[PDB]
Amino acid sequence: SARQRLQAHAETQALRIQRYFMDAYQYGNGFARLVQVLKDRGGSDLRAELTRQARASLAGNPDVIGLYLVFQPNALDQQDSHYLGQDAMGSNESGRFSLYWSQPSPGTLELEAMPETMLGDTSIGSNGAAKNRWLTCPQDTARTCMLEPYLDEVNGRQVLMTSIALPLLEHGKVVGVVGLDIGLANLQQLSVNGRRDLFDGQGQVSIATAAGLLAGNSRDDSVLGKPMDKSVADGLLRVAHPFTPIPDTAPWQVVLELPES
């Protein structure tokens, strides 16, 4: 009937949001391939080159608010002791290559060497997952991870975000992690842009994660990152269509709501 017609629209929006995530995923693998080939060929000045390439990679994608590249201790070049505290080369206090580039707005990139305390913070954050799951998930599973929306701390700023974490593997061994941070403000704009397209804006559009959290909701801004309303008001029919942000992960879904008329 008319519900099959609203479901047909939800499938349209689901493929559009999936294209957004998959393009970021493919873009991250491109940088990961560059990292691996830079590591596999060695040479001098590698850490400074990786830091420069990481910035140019993040600068080349205004849809991404953060890019982290964390290697295991001495996994990058077996010379962590040669780079103690040189944050300008992506190395933290222990010489480990733990680099994070931030892009709070397109074209504004901030450099940061993440300390070992941040890489080991096993305390539980807002979403019920550990604060360092953005790094430990791909390390412990040797596979890519689509992380649930969490509120991160970036230079004194609380940023609500999800992450695409790619593991860098050598013979099945995770030597490092590449990650792309996608702010939920961008996902909120996708739900608002989806609302406008939905029959000229009489309804609402929400993006739900694999755990039921709201990564986007065109109606209220202050509910991002929390469980989606299991119930539903009347006069509007709620349809959903799933989509997969990265290959082989639990699917998210686009939630449409619309008056019957």
Swiss-Prot record:
Q: Residue ranges of the Cache domain?
A: 1-232
Location in the cell reads: Cell membrane
Q: Where does putrescine bind?
A: 150-152, 181
* Signal peptide range: none
Describe the task this protein carries out. Answer: Chemotactic-signal transducers respond to changes in the concentration of attractants and repellents in the environment, transduce a signal from the outside to the inside of the cell, and facilitate sensory adaptation through the variation of the level of methylation. McpU is a chemoreceptor that binds and mediates chemotaxis to polyamines such as putrescine, spermidine, cadaverine and agmatine. Also binds histamine and ethylenediamine with much lower affinities.
* Name of this chain's protein: Methyl-accepting chemotaxis protein McpU
Q: What is the effect of changing residue 152 to A?
A: Does not bind putrescine and spermidine. 12-fold decrease in affinity for cadaverine
Organism (species): Pseudomonas putida (strain ATCC 47054 / DSM 6125 / CFBP 8728 / NCIMB 11950 / KT2440)
* Highest taxon of source: Bacteria
Q: Which family does it belong to?
A: Belongs to the methyl-accepting chemotaxis (MCP) protein family.
The outcome of changing residue 112 to A is: 20-fold decrease in affinity for putrescine. 7-fold decrease in affinity for spermidine. Increases affinity for cadaverine
Comment on protein domains:
The ligand binding domain (LBD) is monomeric in solution. Ligand binding does not cause major conformational changes or alterations in the oligomeric state of the LBD.
Q: Which residues of the full protein are shown?
A: 53 to 313 of 688
Give the disruption phenotype, in one or two sentences: Mutant shows increased biofilm formation as compared to the wild type. Mutation decreases plant root colonization.
